[PDB]
Amino acid sequence: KMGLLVMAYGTPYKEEDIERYYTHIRRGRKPEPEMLQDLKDRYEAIGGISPLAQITEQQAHNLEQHLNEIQDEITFKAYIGLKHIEPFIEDAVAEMHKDGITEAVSIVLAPHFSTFSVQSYNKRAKEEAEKLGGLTITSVESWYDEPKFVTYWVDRVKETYASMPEDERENAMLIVSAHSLPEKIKEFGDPYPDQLHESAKLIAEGAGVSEYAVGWQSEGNTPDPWLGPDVQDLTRDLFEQKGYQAFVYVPVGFVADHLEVLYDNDYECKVVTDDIGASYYRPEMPNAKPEFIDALATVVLKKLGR
Numbered sequence: 001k002m003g004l005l006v007m008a009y010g011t012p013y014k015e016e017d018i019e020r021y022y023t024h025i026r027r028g029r030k031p032e033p034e035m036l037q038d039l040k041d042r043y044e045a046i047g048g049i050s051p052l053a054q055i056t057e058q059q060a061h062n063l064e065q066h067l068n069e070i071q072d073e074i075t076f077k078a079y080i081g082l083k084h085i086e087p088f089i090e091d092a093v094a095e096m097h098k099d100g101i102t103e104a105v106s107i108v109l110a111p112h113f114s115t116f117s118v119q120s121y122n123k124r125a126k127e128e129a130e131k132l133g134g135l136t137i138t139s140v141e142s143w144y145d146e147p148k149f150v151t152y153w154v155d156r157v158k159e160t161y162a163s164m165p166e167d168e169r170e171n172a173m174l175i176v177s178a179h180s181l182p183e184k185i186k187e188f189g190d191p192y193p194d195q196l197h198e199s200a201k202l203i204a205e206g207a208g209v210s211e212y213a214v215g216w217q218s219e220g221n222t223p224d225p226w227l228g229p230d231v232q233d234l235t236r237d238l239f240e241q242k243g244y245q246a247f248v249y250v251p252v253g254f255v256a257d258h259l260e261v262l263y264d265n266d267y268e269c270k271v272v273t274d275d276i277g278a279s280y281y282r283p284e285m286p287n288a289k290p291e292f293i294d295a296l297a298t299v300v301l302k303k304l305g306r
């Protein structure tokens with residue numbers, strides 16, 4: 001029986017947990033009253049926070065189920081480990097250890113590798129495992145290039161373009177994005193930017209979409225500069241240059257209908273498209289769909305030489 005450590009940034013499971021979540025993100029400092037209310041309002045704006053955390057749970061549960069279904073050599077047991085929400089990464093490793101797991105494979109629910117979003121999680125997981133002893137973790141570092149994942153987005157893009165009216169179909173711009181990170185990741189030779197670019201190329205080329213651009217979104221508010229351009233500004237700049245009648249957003253860096261997609265794209269990017277008179281398109285996120293889960297299972301098996 002092998003452990004399957006599924007990690008992610010995390011989202012509050014209950015509305016009452018938002019402040020604590022924010023505090024964790026701010027490394028021990030409670031958010032200012034208004035700052036807190038603003039975040040609460042965004043969750044409200046997208047229909048409520050309750051559904052969100054459940055997607056990650058379903059992704060982990062479905063992945064476990066699928067992996068035990070498609071092959072009969074290994075019996076996987078999933079453990080979710082989150083960065084800012086309990087169960088925390090260390091606690092997940094602690095439970096695997098307590099459960100008797102001696103070997104585990106880990107995967108982060110973010111296809112592109114980055115020092116802040118994949119490496120830090122893997123590092124924290126392995127250090128805790130080392131500390132407890134008798135537990136070896138093999139970690140997936142990036143999977144944006146898994147053919148099945150690329151195909152998922154390629155098909156979603158094909159469907160969207162094939163369904164647009166003529167005026168729009170030949171005057172559209174595809175914007176491929178991921179979550180922005182501080183520019184200082186460059187001090188570590190972080191390939192994150194390169195991977196998003198390759199991810200965009202693979203998808204646009206597979207879909208036969210010639211007009212596309214790479215952008216970043218959801219940057220946090222700190223004194224340091226984050227990766228740009230932001231999808232909002234990119235959309236406007238491109239419209240000003242070519243006057244596109246439609247924009248298709250593929251937030252490939254994200255795997256589910258969370259705040260970044262439902263708000264930063266579906267609301268903020270549509271505000272821009274609405275403002276310049278262009279149509280807004282944003283294909284279905286992977287969430288816990290069978291096609292996506294099978295892509296993840298493949299990534300895990302390949303990592304294990306299976």
Ligand SMILES: CCC1=C(C)c2cc3c(CC)c(C)c(cc4nc(cc5[nH]c(cc1n2)c(C)c5CCC(=O)O)C(CCC(=O)O)=C4C)n3C
Binds near residue numbers: 025182219222224
């Ligand atoms: C890529 C995954 C990712 C997601 C999703 C994410 C989400 C997110 C949320 C949830 C809506 C909130 C309230 C904030 C909002 C924020 N997010 C961060 C800080 C970060 N946010 C980060 C990453 C990150 N943040 C990283 C990495 C940092 C730390 C960067 C660094 O070390 O300098 C801050 C700064 C908090 C502080 O004051 O320390 C705010 C605000 N972020 C951007």
Ligand SMILES: [Mg+2]
Binds near residue numbers: 218219264
């Ligand atoms: Mg924002």
